[PDB]
Amino acid sequence: PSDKHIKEYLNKIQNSLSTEWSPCSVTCGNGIQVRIKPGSANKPKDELDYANDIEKKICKMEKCS
Amino acid sequence: QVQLQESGGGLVQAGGSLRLSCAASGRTFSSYSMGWFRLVPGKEREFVARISSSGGNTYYADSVRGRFTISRDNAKNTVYLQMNSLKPEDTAVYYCAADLLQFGRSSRAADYDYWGQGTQVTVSS
């Protein structure tokens, strides 16, 4: 997933960010999963640093048909 | 793909003030968080300030806190950096940068998506 894909997904769930892993951003192909890092728990939305506070991992789904 | 262009650099006496501006082409400026960075030769680009896409939240490096102000006019597709009480240590090429992330903090140059071409700012004692 591109930087644009990751950030546009964060913008969409921006008021739903929590320490819980999000679902995959896509149902097919490669997407991202995001969460607030446990060390950053309870940091309000507007204090979250993109690099330091938001954990991001790739989620691979089945190819798109 | 949005084009960013700075204006306002130049020579200024220590203790003086300067207003830099940065204009975005097209019709996407309002969807970006905007940032300013500065390049001293021999170091990485240093974060100066950031403003969310709405303009409701701003963030500063401690080296300019209390002296610089970042603001935006979404009607003009322009972001601004007002610099007061300038010091010789403020001498640098200043760059605007656009971030697709519309909220939160971001202080690393690598995590911004579009860049202007830089305007030199020189502060003599």
Author numbering:
A (entry chain B): 311 to 375
B (entry chain A): 1 to 125
Quote the passages of the study that discuss this structure, keeping the authors' original sentences.
The SPZ’s main surface antigen, the circumsporozoite protein (CSP), plays a pivotal role in SPZ biology and constitutes the immunodominant target for host antibodies. PfCSP contains an intrinsically disordered N-terminal domain (PfCSPN), a flexible linker region composed of NANP and NVDP repeats (PfCSPrep) and is flanked by N- and C-terminal junctions (PfCSPNTJ and PfCSPCTJ, respectively) and a globular C-terminal domain (PfCSPC) adopting a so-called αTSR fold that is connected to the SPZ plasma membrane via a GPI anchor. In this paper, we describe the functional characterization of 12 camelid single-domain antibodies (sdAbs, also known as nanobodies) targeting PfCSPC. sdAbs correspond to the variable domain (VHH) of heavy-chain only Abs (HCAbs) found in camelids (llamas, alpacas, camels, and dromedaries). A structural characterization of the sdAb-PfCSPC complexes through macromolecular X-ray crystallography (MX) and/or AlphaFold-Multimer shows that most sdAbs target the non-protective α-epitope.
Diffraction quality crystals were obtained for PfCSPC–sdAb1 and PfCSPC–sdAb9 complexes, and data were collected to ∼2.1 Å. The crystal structures reveal that sdAb1 and 9 target the PfCSPCα-epitope. This epitope is composed of the Region III residues (adopting an α-helical structure), the flexible loop between the two antiparallel β-strands of the TSR fold (referred to as the CSP-flap), and the hydrophobic pocket between the α-helix and the CSP-flap. The paratopes of sdAb1 and 9 are largely similar, which is expected, as they belong to the same VHH family. Noteworthy ‘interaction hot spots’ are sdAb1 amino acids L101 and F103 that are inserted into the hydrophobic pocket delineated by PfCSP residues L320, L327, L358, Y360, and I364. Three other important interactions are the salt bridges formed at either side of the α-epitope between sdAb1 R105 and PfCSP E357 (left side, only for sdAb1–PfCSPC) and sdAb D99/D113 and PfCSP K317 (right side, both complexes), which likely stabilize the hydrophobic interaction center. For the sdAb1–PfCSPC complex, the experimentally determined crystal structure further validates results recently obtained through a combination of molecular modeling and mass spectrometry. We note that the predictions were highly accurate, displaying an almost perfect overlap with the experimentally determined crystal structures (Cα RMSDs of 0.99 and 1.08 Å for sdAb1–PfCSPC and sdAb9–PfCSPC, respectively). Indeed, fluorescence imaging of fixed PfCSP–PbSPZs shows that sdAb1 more readily interacts with MG SPZs compared to SG SPZs, independent of their maturation state.
